[PDB]
Amino acid sequence: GQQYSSAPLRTVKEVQFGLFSPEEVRAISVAKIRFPETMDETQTRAKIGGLNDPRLGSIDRNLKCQTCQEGMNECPGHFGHIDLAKPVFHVGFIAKIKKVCECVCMHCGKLLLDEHNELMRQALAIKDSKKRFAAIWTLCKTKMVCETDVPSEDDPTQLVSRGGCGNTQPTIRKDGLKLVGSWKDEPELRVLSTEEILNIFKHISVKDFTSLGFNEVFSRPEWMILTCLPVPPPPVRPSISFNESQRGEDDLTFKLADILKANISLETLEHNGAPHHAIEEAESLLQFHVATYMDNDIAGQPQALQKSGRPVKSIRARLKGKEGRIRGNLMGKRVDFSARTVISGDPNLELDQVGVPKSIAKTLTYPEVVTPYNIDRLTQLVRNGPNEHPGAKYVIRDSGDRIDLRYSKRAGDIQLQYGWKVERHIMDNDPVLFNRQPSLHKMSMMAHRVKVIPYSTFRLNLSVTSPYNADFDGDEMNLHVPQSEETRAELSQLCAVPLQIVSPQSNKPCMGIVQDTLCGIRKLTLRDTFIELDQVLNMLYWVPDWDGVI
Amino acid sequence: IFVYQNNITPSAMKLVPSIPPATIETFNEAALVVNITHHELVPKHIRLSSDEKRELLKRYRLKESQLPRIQRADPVALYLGLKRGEVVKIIRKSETSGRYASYRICM
Amino acid sequence: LKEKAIPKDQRATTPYMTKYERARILGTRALQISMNAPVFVDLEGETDPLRIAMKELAEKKIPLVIRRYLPDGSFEDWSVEELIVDL
Amino acid sequence: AGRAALYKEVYNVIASDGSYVNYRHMALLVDVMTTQGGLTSVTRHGFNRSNTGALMRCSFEETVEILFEAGASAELDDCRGVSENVILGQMAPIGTGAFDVMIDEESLVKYM
Amino acid sequence: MFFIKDLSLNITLHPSFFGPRMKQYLKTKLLEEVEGSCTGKFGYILCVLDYDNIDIQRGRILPTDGSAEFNVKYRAVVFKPFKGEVVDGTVVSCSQHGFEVQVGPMKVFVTKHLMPQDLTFNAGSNPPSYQSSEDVITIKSRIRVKIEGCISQVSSIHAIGSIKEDYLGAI
Amino acid sequence: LRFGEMERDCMIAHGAASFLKERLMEASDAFRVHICGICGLMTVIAKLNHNQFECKGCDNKIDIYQIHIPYAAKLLFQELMAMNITPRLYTDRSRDF
Amino acid sequence: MNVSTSTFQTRRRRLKKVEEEENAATLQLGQEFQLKQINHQGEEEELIALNLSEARLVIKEALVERRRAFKRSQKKTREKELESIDVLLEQTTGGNNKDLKNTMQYLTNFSRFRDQETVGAVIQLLKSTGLHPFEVAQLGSLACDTADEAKTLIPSLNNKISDDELERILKELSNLETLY
Amino acid sequence: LVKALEDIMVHYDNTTRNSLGNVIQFIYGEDGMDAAHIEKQSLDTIGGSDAAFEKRYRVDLLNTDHTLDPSLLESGSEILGDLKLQVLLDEEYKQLVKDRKFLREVFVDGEANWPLPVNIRRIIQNAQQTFHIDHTKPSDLTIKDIVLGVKDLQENLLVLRGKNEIIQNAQRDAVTLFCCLLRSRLATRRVLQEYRLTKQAFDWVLSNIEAQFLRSVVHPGEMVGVLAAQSIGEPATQMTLNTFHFSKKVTSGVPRLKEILNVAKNMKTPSLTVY
Ligand SMILES: [Mg+2]
Ligand SMILES: [Zn+2]
Ligand SMILES: [Zn+2]
Ligand SMILES: [Zn+2]
């Protein structure tokens, strides 16, 4: 955001999901993440050539980024990479990896069941990329022979070679984050090495894996296994750096240093005097930290808890709903130009009005563009200042730079220019979204005409009590101020209280006369009830439209 | 159409797709006692010709996938002897319009 | 493709303007008016860009066109000038 | 007939509480649970297991698992679901977003 | 070489220009941006043909801002040099390292070493020259060059050429 | 204040698409990123002022676009990449309905 | 990079690595300069290449018509050719366009055939050859005397034409040559 | 409910589709009308004795005591015996009979009060007020004016526009019930004897029914999915329940709604109703 860029501005028309190839991870990388350390080497408290590191983005408000030289706000951050000492399963694909293993010969890489098998032919025909893989799996899982030859479609007596070796297939089971096979006096039991799984996957034909759920360009099964790990830049794992002599690294920064630590342990162990049953130990550890980094809340396994004993935020857990990125940061957001206070009803507001306390009106602003129509009014609001009620808070120049009327030494001699925006106070009759949560209705959010009033409560007409499901038992409501001439039009023309009167929920109106007015209307409209002139004249005057005819 | 009492052995069942283009239907006598199509809730399903279906998709700018489906094993689908892809025009009475027509493609 | 554009003759969407098309025309025009675009109607002392836009719509002097997309991706273009505004 | 009975049963829940809901609403829910020939539940493994947008479906109940499968099967989100445009911060093809607005230079020059 | 290409630029106009001199403004902003431009993809966009019939099409109004985006379809004369392309040009500069040759909008540079042995530099000549037993190459001489390779730069395409092969050199 | 999922629903119900966008973007976390036109990631090293844009390991300095998305979405995407998932954003359609 | 220019060729380039090939006179021009082009009317149209003589007359004509449109909206021979084009440029061009002034001076100084009549007859002559647009352009742009002079400078040719056939063309081209 | 219906919207082709463009409803709520523009109205031809229906709707210009009295319209005296005209009223009535039997097929219980789109009672009311209809002097309407005027109005009640037999038959269906009500309320005897409409008044009732009807159709862009979801959901939140504190005691309200949406196989109160 914020600075000008010559790059063409378009909209995302498609999202192509896929898997990272290790090759991509390296190409796309700005730093080879080498050390678990974050800085303070040579003495200097400033990011190290290993973790975090300038190559990735800024820790400080430096202006430096090394990569783009743009600075914190503008810089999105750039990915680094860690070359892993041994391949590791991506925790989220362990079951799929097992199912791919169950479908293919764990030796020659051929898909265990050919287009020679009739049931397989039907399964292959399935157009659904996933339902096909389901049908393929159910058929191949119970195939424990990689056939050399098979009965021909013409005659089943004279068998035809379909290709592939003649190896027995293992009965695969999941034991933690490992896969163990059982071939066939007594069965042979051994763990399947991540390398071995990967090698077999690399040997699966394009035609074979595109017959499984996979994609030649975007998700080759071999990419479910990780060799080159991308390192998310600092904006994903912000170092909340308080004071000078202190920092505050993110959970992810620790888990990554753990991955790094475990990796060096493994790489130095295998390179040097490898006891080979201490190598498998460090490899299990690297598999644990790479698994537990993406998902920490793994089925029937211990949690990878912090120093504190605090479980550690998995990237998974970050996105997992109600408060995830998706449910809490994207489908929902806390928003600017919003207000909230206790509501209390008013018989002297119109149905479509909303009483806004002066303090609230004085905080919330509308960005009005200086034009020949308002130039005169707008200069008065700017003159009035951010403290008087009909006033303004900021003046935005052509330059895009904001003038703070509270402090500007030129706040009194501002001479507006067409094009500038005056961020003025919300004034009477501005359309605003008014809302009582839970928002179960179209009507739980309606557009109202502002009425700036004294006292600290939002005032509403009593007949609009029903659609909101509001009481004055101490209920609070939200106000949202639109900022575009366009979004106001949306509120006024589509969701304003009068429009919302006859609801499509029940093909009947969702507002009517209530409480005092309902009780009193029966009372007034009785045969027995009569009114003397004195009061008739007041009761007439009170009707604002009244034609002036007694 | 073979109307069987209790069962048709799987050894006999092998013979059903054995003689194409001709299609064979297996119906249990017990299911046929009541004509389900006669039920209060069962509307009228009308089998559409190749041309009739082509026109449907043309006129609503539809891909077969977009059409609401009917399972090949659906009681009414079986009754009309619906094959895969065959589209059925369902005419039900409506409390909103008087009569409403939906279409269901076979599976 | 440009088999996408449905021709003026043989067009079948409502010859009327939708509540949404009105809300977006008024908004769009008020936004344009608000950011100093030339106004095609004589403002008879008018100053609110929405009130000016409404006057523009009322005199059918809005030079916008609605591109109505069909589910297949095809479209019928309808001018603000030609659409009936019952609402 | 399943659809008919399903409507009846949904309606009878609403009608019993006295309250009235216009036919079309209950009809639409019932129609949705039925278009794909058979009874599609309004649950995690019902509607959320459709061929709809990977981003759209992750927005309800099986989020990360959904997105993992998106990568593994190289899914392509069309971006026509409200949800995707909400995630992308784009004007959704909803109501006011169902069409496009264009300036006609011809009519512009005709008005001036 | 020197092509005629069918190209299209997307211009975004601010609401203030939604007046009648719009197609007028657009067609000009097209020439502002595109004319005299230089890409690697198309080379030098030299002159926009058929100003009178430039296709503005309908302009889509961008949603949160009032501006309208037009895809202005046009057709122009372009210059794209290539390796193996034989060019006729005129000397522009000349030093101890070689001489530059102005070929249309771009310069082709001949190396001391991409010239025949017999042709050798002379510092003491006004302006400096390259002297062979028969011909002399200086600041204004016409040369036929064979483009050995091209380098794409911001708003230019520079190239290296040879006058070593037969039928290449002074003209 | 919160413009939560439920408030999103109501705006959709109203068909107020522009208001919803404003609420989610301009009134909250709207952000500008540079996308690669080839590989569709936020890889672009945009030194905007020198006017340089590059997707090294694509060698792309031509097919580059700018997009406005919620920062939370920019984040979500980097988070998915951190977990080896490629959420490739493309500015043009490839299928057609 | 910037809001650059699009083409009428549709790029299908999804993820696939930059497999872009060599540019030579093995007539391996760009993808952007393929023989089978597509004009703005969606029709397949053959590549357009210009001999300096054509190229000058095109830019001249274009700028001349532009002056006409500019004077309409306003309402409501060798060195003396160079002199005059510099004046047309002062009017129809942005002046910031140094490239076109440089181009016009080059074409005005290197054009083999001056008047349209001859540039048409040259076009009609090389038309028949059925050679690549680029080769037909070079045969107009580069003056050759030997079939070998031509076949050397335009290697692309080689076996495409007879030595004597090309020499008949090169002769006709010298005859059509304007005496500046 | 919301997350299951989000992407359902009405398209510019009057169809109801999701983000896949799969058809859900061929036209919103089988009638193609915006729920807000609907009101409970009585379909008169459905109920009562056939004798009472006959008295209400039958006109027989060939029967001295079953014609329209000249007190009803000017033409009255000269309309008696008009064979060609009796062919119009005969067809008019044959259709009113058709409607009655059809309605009885749709609403089996003989329920007449159904929410439909144009408040015809109010139009006639307003017309009478507007024109100060004198329920004394004879109308200036002709049999053809009424008979063919109503016939012509029907053709202009457009929900679907499309120059093809599929889209056109779709249109005929969508207006099948409304027309039933229309034919019911604007029958020759009703128009002349009940409402005492003049040609002016009648022509106005027609132009208004047309206008009001067109106004009543759903707007493409209508986010009809979320609408439906919320319209079922919000009433659920207002449920006391379960099924009193005691016919059959079937599980109801929130627990039965949960049971339904889950498509629960093992349900609390399974039961048949054998007739
Ligand atoms: Mg309370
Ligand atoms: Zn950076
Ligand atoms: Zn094998
Ligand atoms: Zn890239």
mmCIF file with all atom_site columns, all heavy atoms in Angstrom, chain C residues 24 60 63 65 67 69 81, chain D residues 96 99-100 102 104 110-112:
data_model
loop_
_atom_site.group_PDB
_atom_site.id
_atom_site.type_symbol
_atom_site.label_atom_id
_atom_site.label_alt_id
_atom_site.label_comp_id
_atom_site.label_asym_id
_atom_site.label_entity_id
_atom_site.label_seq_id
_atom_site.pdbx_PDB_ins_code
_atom_site.Cartn_x
_atom_site.Cartn_y
_atom_site.Cartn_z
_atom_site.occupancy
_atom_site.B_iso_or_equiv
_atom_site.pdbx_formal_charge
_atom_site.auth_seq_id
_atom_site.auth_comp_id
_atom_site.auth_asym_id
_atom_site.auth_atom_id
_atom_site.pdbx_PDB_model_num
ATOM 1   N N   . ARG C 1 24  ? -26.415 1.917   -8.179  1.00 0.00 ? 24  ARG C N   1
ATOM 2   C CA  . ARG C 1 24  ? -25.053 2.055   -8.720  1.00 0.00 ? 24  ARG C CA  1
ATOM 3   C C   . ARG C 1 24  ? -24.939 3.215   -9.733  1.00 0.00 ? 24  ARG C C   1
ATOM 4   O O   . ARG C 1 24  ? -23.898 3.884   -9.769  1.00 0.00 ? 24  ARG C O   1
ATOM 5   C CB  . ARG C 1 24  ? -24.436 0.743   -9.262  1.00 0.00 ? 24  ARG C CB  1
ATOM 6   C CG  . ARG C 1 24  ? -22.884 0.772   -9.173  1.00 0.00 ? 24  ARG C CG  1
ATOM 7   C CD  . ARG C 1 24  ? -22.134 -0.498  -9.526  1.00 0.00 ? 24  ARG C CD  1
ATOM 8   N NE  . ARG C 1 24  ? -20.887 -0.204  -10.231 1.00 0.00 ? 24  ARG C NE  1
ATOM 9   C CZ  . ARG C 1 24  ? -20.230 -1.093  -10.967 1.00 0.00 ? 24  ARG C CZ  1
ATOM 10  N NH1 . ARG C 1 24  ? -20.673 -2.342  -11.065 1.00 0.00 ? 24  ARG C NH1 1
ATOM 11  N NH2 . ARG C 1 24  ? -19.117 -0.746  -11.603 1.00 0.00 ? 24  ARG C NH2 1
ATOM 12  N N   . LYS C 1 60  ? -32.663 11.679  -18.004 1.00 0.00 ? 60  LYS C N   1
ATOM 13  C CA  . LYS C 1 60  ? -32.005 10.635  -18.818 1.00 0.00 ? 60  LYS C CA  1
ATOM 14  C C   . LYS C 1 60  ? -30.743 11.143  -19.592 1.00 0.00 ? 60  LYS C C   1
ATOM 15  O O   . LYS C 1 60  ? -30.394 10.640  -20.666 1.00 0.00 ? 60  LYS C O   1
ATOM 16  C CB  . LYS C 1 60  ? -33.000 9.914   -19.742 1.00 0.00 ? 60  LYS C CB  1
ATOM 17  C CG  . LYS C 1 60  ? -33.873 8.901   -19.018 1.00 0.00 ? 60  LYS C CG  1
ATOM 18  C CD  . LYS C 1 60  ? -33.081 7.707   -18.452 1.00 0.00 ? 60  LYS C CD  1
ATOM 19  C CE  . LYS C 1 60  ? -33.989 6.685   -17.844 1.00 0.00 ? 60  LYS C CE  1
ATOM 20  N NZ  . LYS C 1 60  ? -35.083 6.294   -18.783 1.00 0.00 ? 60  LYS C NZ  1
ATOM 21  N N   . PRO C 1 63  ? -24.573 9.564   -19.249 1.00 0.00 ? 63  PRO C N   1
ATOM 22  C CA  . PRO C 1 63  ? -23.948 8.883   -20.388 1.00 0.00 ? 63  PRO C CA  1
ATOM 23  C C   . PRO C 1 63  ? -23.328 7.529   -20.064 1.00 0.00 ? 63  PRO C C   1
ATOM 24  O O   . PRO C 1 63  ? -22.391 7.104   -20.747 1.00 0.00 ? 63  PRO C O   1
ATOM 25  C CB  . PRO C 1 63  ? -22.932 9.910   -20.880 1.00 0.00 ? 63  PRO C CB  1
ATOM 26  C CG  . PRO C 1 63  ? -22.473 10.551  -19.651 1.00 0.00 ? 63  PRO C CG  1
ATOM 27  C CD  . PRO C 1 63  ? -23.633 10.540  -18.665 1.00 0.00 ? 63  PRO C CD  1
ATOM 28  N N   . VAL C 1 65  ? -23.748 3.200   -19.386 1.00 0.00 ? 65  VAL C N   1
ATOM 29  C CA  . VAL C 1 65  ? -24.364 2.013   -19.963 1.00 0.00 ? 65  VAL C CA  1
ATOM 30  C C   . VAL C 1 65  ? -24.094 0.858   -18.985 1.00 0.00 ? 65  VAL C C   1
ATOM 31  O O   . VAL C 1 65  ? -22.939 0.682   -18.542 1.00 0.00 ? 65  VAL C O   1
ATOM 32  C CB  . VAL C 1 65  ? -23.750 1.709   -21.363 1.00 0.00 ? 65  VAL C CB  1
ATOM 33  C CG1 . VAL C 1 65  ? -24.120 0.310   -21.859 1.00 0.00 ? 65  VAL C CG1 1
ATOM 34  C CG2 . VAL C 1 65  ? -24.130 2.772   -22.387 1.00 0.00 ? 65  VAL C CG2 1
ATOM 35  N N   . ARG C 1 67  ? -23.653 -3.063  -18.383 1.00 0.00 ? 67  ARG C N   1
ATOM 36  C CA  . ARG C 1 67  ? -23.277 -4.312  -19.008 1.00 0.00 ? 67  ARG C CA  1
ATOM 37  C C   . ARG C 1 67  ? -23.843 -5.445  -18.113 1.00 0.00 ? 67  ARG C C   1
ATOM 38  O O   . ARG C 1 67  ? -23.294 -5.741  -17.035 1.00 0.00 ? 67  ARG C O   1
ATOM 39  C CB  . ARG C 1 67  ? -21.760 -4.408  -19.194 1.00 0.00 ? 67  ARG C CB  1
ATOM 40  C CG  . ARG C 1 67  ? -21.367 -5.716  -19.876 1.00 0.00 ? 67  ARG C CG  1
ATOM 41  C CD  . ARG C 1 67  ? -20.093 -5.656  -20.687 1.00 0.00 ? 67  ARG C CD  1
ATOM 42  N NE  . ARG C 1 67  ? -20.155 -4.649  -21.738 1.00 0.00 ? 67  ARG C NE  1
ATOM 43  C CZ  . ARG C 1 67  ? -19.198 -4.458  -22.631 1.00 0.00 ? 67  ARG C CZ  1
ATOM 44  N NH1 . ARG C 1 67  ? -18.127 -5.239  -22.643 1.00 0.00 ? 67  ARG C NH1 1
ATOM 45  N NH2 . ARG C 1 67  ? -19.315 -3.497  -23.539 1.00 0.00 ? 67  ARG C NH2 1
ATOM 46  N N   . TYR C 1 69  ? -24.345 -9.017  -17.116 1.00 0.00 ? 69  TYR C N   1
ATOM 47  C CA  . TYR C 1 69  ? -23.767 -10.338 -17.343 1.00 0.00 ? 69  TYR C CA  1
ATOM 48  C C   . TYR C 1 69  ? -24.697 -11.504 -17.048 1.00 0.00 ? 69  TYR C C   1
ATOM 49  O O   . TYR C 1 69  ? -25.335 -11.598 -15.974 1.00 0.00 ? 69  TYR C O   1
ATOM 50  C CB  . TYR C 1 69  ? -22.441 -10.511 -16.602 1.00 0.00 ? 69  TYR C CB  1
ATOM 51  C CG  . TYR C 1 69  ? -21.363 -9.582  -17.104 1.00 0.00 ? 69  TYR C CG  1
ATOM 52  C CD1 . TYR C 1 69  ? -21.090 -8.383  -16.451 1.00 0.00 ? 69  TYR C CD1 1
ATOM 53  C CD2 . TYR C 1 69  ? -20.616 -9.897  -18.231 1.00 0.00 ? 69  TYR C CD2 1
ATOM 54  C CE1 . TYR C 1 69  ? -20.082 -7.531  -16.895 1.00 0.00 ? 69  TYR C CE1 1
ATOM 55  C CE2 . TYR C 1 69  ? -19.634 -9.034  -18.709 1.00 0.00 ? 69  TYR C CE2 1
ATOM 56  C CZ  . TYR C 1 69  ? -19.356 -7.858  -18.027 1.00 0.00 ? 69  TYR C CZ  1
ATOM 57  O OH  . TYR C 1 69  ? -18.374 -7.013  -18.492 1.00 0.00 ? 69  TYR C OH  1
ATOM 58  N N   . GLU C 1 81  ? -30.144 5.888   -20.564 1.00 0.00 ? 81  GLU C N   1
ATOM 59  C CA  . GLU C 1 81  ? -31.113 6.561   -21.416 1.00 0.00 ? 81  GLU C CA  1
ATOM 60  C C   . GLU C 1 81  ? -32.353 5.694   -21.754 1.00 0.00 ? 81  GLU C C   1
ATOM 61  O O   . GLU C 1 81  ? -33.467 6.194   -21.622 1.00 0.00 ? 81  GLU C O   1
ATOM 62  C CB  . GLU C 1 81  ? -30.409 7.068   -22.686 1.00 0.00 ? 81  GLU C CB  1
ATOM 63  C CG  . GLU C 1 81  ? -31.257 7.870   -23.669 1.00 0.00 ? 81  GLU C CG  1
ATOM 64  C CD  . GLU C 1 81  ? -30.507 8.624   -24.758 1.00 0.00 ? 81  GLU C CD  1
ATOM 65  O OE1 . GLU C 1 81  ? -29.255 8.570   -24.810 1.00 0.00 ? 81  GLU C OE1 1
ATOM 66  O OE2 . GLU C 1 81  ? -31.189 9.297   -25.559 1.00 0.00 ? 81  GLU C OE2 1
ATOM 67  N N   . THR D 2 96  ? -25.630 -4.895  -6.368  1.00 0.00 ? 96  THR D N   1
ATOM 68  C CA  . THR D 2 96  ? -24.933 -3.765  -6.999  1.00 0.00 ? 96  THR D CA  1
ATOM 69  C C   . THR D 2 96  ? -23.638 -4.177  -7.855  1.00 0.00 ? 96  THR D C   1
ATOM 70  O O   . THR D 2 96  ? -23.181 -3.433  -8.735  1.00 0.00 ? 96  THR D O   1
ATOM 71  C CB  . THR D 2 96  ? -24.684 -2.785  -5.845  1.00 0.00 ? 96  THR D CB  1
ATOM 72  O OG1 . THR D 2 96  ? -25.282 -1.537  -6.162  1.00 0.00 ? 96  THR D OG1 1
ATOM 73  C CG2 . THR D 2 96  ? -23.232 -2.666  -5.416  1.00 0.00 ? 96  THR D CG2 1
ATOM 74  N N   . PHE D 2 99  ? -23.485 -6.470  -12.337 1.00 0.00 ? 99  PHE D N   1
ATOM 75  C CA  . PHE D 2 99  ? -23.332 -5.878  -13.666 1.00 0.00 ? 99  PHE D CA  1
ATOM 76  C C   . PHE D 2 99  ? -22.115 -4.984  -13.715 1.00 0.00 ? 99  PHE D C   1
ATOM 77  O O   . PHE D 2 99  ? -21.411 -4.846  -12.709 1.00 0.00 ? 99  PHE D O   1
ATOM 78  C CB  . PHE D 2 99  ? -24.591 -5.065  -14.021 1.00 0.00 ? 99  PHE D CB  1
ATOM 79  C CG  . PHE D 2 99  ? -24.935 -4.036  -12.976 1.00 0.00 ? 99  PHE D CG  1
ATOM 80  C CD1 . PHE D 2 99  ? -24.498 -2.725  -13.103 1.00 0.00 ? 99  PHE D CD1 1
ATOM 81  C CD2 . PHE D 2 99  ? -25.665 -4.385  -11.845 1.00 0.00 ? 99  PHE D CD2 1
ATOM 82  C CE1 . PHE D 2 99  ? -24.795 -1.784  -12.125 1.00 0.00 ? 99  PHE D CE1 1
ATOM 83  C CE2 . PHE D 2 99  ? -25.953 -3.443  -10.864 1.00 0.00 ? 99  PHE D CE2 1
ATOM 84  C CZ  . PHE D 2 99  ? -25.523 -2.150  -11.016 1.00 0.00 ? 99  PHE D CZ  1
ATOM 85  N N   . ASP D 2 100 ? -21.887 -4.351  -14.868 1.00 0.00 ? 100 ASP D N   1
ATOM 86  C CA  . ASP D 2 100 ? -20.749 -3.467  -15.061 1.00 0.00 ? 100 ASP D CA  1
ATOM 87  C C   . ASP D 2 100 ? -21.212 -2.125  -15.545 1.00 0.00 ? 100 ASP D C   1
ATOM 88  O O   . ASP D 2 100 ? -22.199 -2.059  -16.264 1.00 0.00 ? 100 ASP D O   1
ATOM 89  C CB  . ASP D 2 100 ? -19.792 -4.079  -16.093 1.00 0.00 ? 100 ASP D CB  1
ATOM 90  C CG  . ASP D 2 100 ? -18.396 -4.324  -15.560 1.00 0.00 ? 100 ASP D CG  1
ATOM 91  O OD1 . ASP D 2 100 ? -17.849 -3.408  -14.869 1.00 0.00 ? 100 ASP D OD1 1
ATOM 92  O OD2 . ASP D 2 100 ? -17.846 -5.436  -15.813 1.00 0.00 ? 100 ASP D OD2 1
ATOM 93  N N   . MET D 2 102 ? -20.344 1.266   -17.818 1.00 0.00 ? 102 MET D N   1
ATOM 94  C CA  . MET D 2 102 ? -19.448 1.797   -18.823 1.00 0.00 ? 102 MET D CA  1
ATOM 95  C C   . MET D 2 102 ? -19.811 3.187   -19.271 1.00 0.00 ? 102 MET D C   1
ATOM 96  O O   . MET D 2 102 ? -20.993 3.499   -19.226 1.00 0.00 ? 102 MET D O   1
ATOM 97  C CB  . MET D 2 102 ? -19.488 0.882   -20.021 1.00 0.00 ? 102 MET D CB  1
ATOM 98  C CG  . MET D 2 102 ? -18.280 0.043   -20.115 1.00 0.00 ? 102 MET D CG  1
ATOM 99  S SD  . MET D 2 102 ? -18.749 -1.670  -20.197 1.00 0.00 ? 102 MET D SD  1
ATOM 100 C CE  . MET D 2 102 ? -17.884 -2.299  -18.787 1.00 0.00 ? 102 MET D CE  1
ATOM 101 N N   . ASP D 2 104 ? -20.402 5.722   -22.340 1.00 0.00 ? 104 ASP D N   1
ATOM 102 C CA  . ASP D 2 104 ? -20.549 5.747   -23.787 1.00 0.00 ? 104 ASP D CA  1
ATOM 103 C C   . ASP D 2 104 ? -20.245 7.149   -24.258 1.00 0.00 ? 104 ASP D C   1
ATOM 104 O O   . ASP D 2 104 ? -20.987 8.083   -23.942 1.00 0.00 ? 104 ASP D O   1
ATOM 105 C CB  . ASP D 2 104 ? -21.913 5.247   -24.287 1.00 0.00 ? 104 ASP D CB  1
ATOM 106 C CG  . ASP D 2 104 ? -22.013 5.156   -25.816 1.00 0.00 ? 104 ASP D CG  1
ATOM 107 O OD1 . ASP D 2 104 ? -20.957 4.888   -26.486 1.00 0.00 ? 104 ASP D OD1 1
ATOM 108 O OD2 . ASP D 2 104 ? -23.133 5.328   -26.344 1.00 0.00 ? 104 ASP D OD2 1
ATOM 109 N N   . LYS D 2 110 ? -23.428 13.565  -27.352 1.00 0.00 ? 110 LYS D N   1
ATOM 110 C CA  . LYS D 2 110 ? -24.852 13.839  -27.638 1.00 0.00 ? 110 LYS D CA  1
ATOM 111 C C   . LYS D 2 110 ? -25.468 14.749  -26.526 1.00 0.00 ? 110 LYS D C   1
ATOM 112 O O   . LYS D 2 110 ? -26.318 15.589  -26.830 1.00 0.00 ? 110 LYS D O   1
ATOM 113 C CB  . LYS D 2 110 ? -25.617 12.496  -27.776 1.00 0.00 ? 110 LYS D CB  1
ATOM 114 C CG  . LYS D 2 110 ? -27.130 12.574  -27.986 1.00 0.00 ? 110 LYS D CG  1
ATOM 115 C CD  . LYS D 2 110 ? -27.880 11.559  -27.101 1.00 0.00 ? 110 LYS D CD  1
ATOM 116 C CE  . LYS D 2 110 ? -28.161 10.208  -27.730 1.00 0.00 ? 110 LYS D CE  1
ATOM 117 N NZ  . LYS D 2 110 ? -29.571 10.100  -28.217 1.00 0.00 ? 110 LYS D NZ  1
ATOM 118 N N   . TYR D 2 111 ? -25.017 14.595  -25.256 1.00 0.00 ? 111 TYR D N   1
ATOM 119 C CA  . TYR D 2 111 ? -25.507 15.408  -24.139 1.00 0.00 ? 111 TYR D CA  1
ATOM 120 C C   . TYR D 2 111 ? -24.802 16.784  -24.021 1.00 0.00 ? 111 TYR D C   1
ATOM 121 O O   . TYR D 2 111 ? -25.291 17.652  -23.275 1.00 0.00 ? 111 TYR D O   1
ATOM 122 C CB  . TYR D 2 111 ? -25.453 14.645  -22.801 1.00 0.00 ? 111 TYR D CB  1
ATOM 123 C CG  . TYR D 2 111 ? -26.180 13.315  -22.758 1.00 0.00 ? 111 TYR D CG  1
ATOM 124 C CD1 . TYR D 2 111 ? -25.738 12.287  -21.934 1.00 0.00 ? 111 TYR D CD1 1
ATOM 125 C CD2 . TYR D 2 111 ? -27.354 13.110  -23.476 1.00 0.00 ? 111 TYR D CD2 1
ATOM 126 C CE1 . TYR D 2 111 ? -26.397 11.062  -21.888 1.00 0.00 ? 111 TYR D CE1 1
ATOM 127 C CE2 . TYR D 2 111 ? -28.023 11.886  -23.439 1.00 0.00 ? 111 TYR D CE2 1
ATOM 128 C CZ  . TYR D 2 111 ? -27.536 10.862  -22.646 1.00 0.00 ? 111 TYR D CZ  1
ATOM 129 O OH  . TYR D 2 111 ? -28.176 9.648   -22.584 1.00 0.00 ? 111 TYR D OH  1
ATOM 130 N N   . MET D 2 112 ? -23.662 16.976  -24.770 1.00 0.00 ? 112 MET D N   1
ATOM 131 C CA  . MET D 2 112 ? -22.830 18.197  -24.827 1.00 0.00 ? 112 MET D CA  1
ATOM 132 C C   . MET D 2 112 ? -22.264 18.463  -26.246 1.00 0.00 ? 112 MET D C   1
ATOM 133 O O   . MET D 2 112 ? -22.532 19.494  -26.873 1.00 0.00 ? 112 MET D O   1
ATOM 134 C CB  . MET D 2 112 ? -21.672 18.096  -23.819 1.00 0.00 ? 112 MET D CB  1
ATOM 135 C CG  . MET D 2 112 ? -22.071 18.358  -22.373 1.00 0.00 ? 112 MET D CG  1
ATOM 136 S SD  . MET D 2 112 ? -20.651 18.533  -21.247 1.00 0.00 ? 112 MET D SD  1
ATOM 137 C CE  . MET D 2 112 ? -21.474 18.838  -19.731 1.00 0.00 ? 112 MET D CE  1
#
